[PDB]
Design a protein around this ligand. Structure first.
Ligand code: HEM
Length: 104
């Protein structure tokens, strides 16, 4: 009817995830994996300010810094929708090309 345990993994590119961090597509990267919590921002104890500033990037450095509970880290497993491209993981050989416009 309206229930389906769909488990998959979509490999997204760095330029794709860092361009979806707006409001209803706010994704965070943890352990080089893409986690969807754009509808859990207000459900996160502490606030969304710390999430929006890490949206579209890897915040694993803060995940281990703060120290999440066992159940907490297990909960994130239900918000996994994909992973980062191998080129953006064990390569990083992709031209950025930016900051060429003076909007100051
Ligand atoms: C994006 C995935 C994340 C999930 C699913 C998540 C989930 C949770 C949950 C369930 C708790 C409370 C449970 C407990 O008692 O341990 C928690 C607490 C907390 N989280 Fe996260 N979190 C995430 C990311 C982050 C990130 C990226 C930061 C930092 C920018 C962060 C900072 C905190 C802090 C500070 C607390 C409270 C600990 C304290 O204030 O001493 N979380 N998180």
């Amino acid at each position: 009817m309206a229930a389906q345990s769909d488990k998959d993994v979509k490999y997204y590119t760095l330029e794709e995830i860092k361009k979806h961090n707006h409001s209803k597509s706010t994704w965070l990267i943890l352990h080089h994996k893409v986690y969807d919590l754009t509808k859990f921002l207000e459900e996160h104890p502490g606030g969304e300010e710390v999430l929006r500033e890490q949206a579209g990037g890897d915040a694993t450095e803060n995940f281990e810094d703060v120290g999440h509970s066992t159940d907490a880290r297990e909960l994130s497993k239900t918000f996994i929708i994909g992973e980062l491209h191998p080129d953006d993981r064990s390569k990083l050989s992709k031209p950025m090309e930016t900051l060429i416009t003076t909007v100051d």
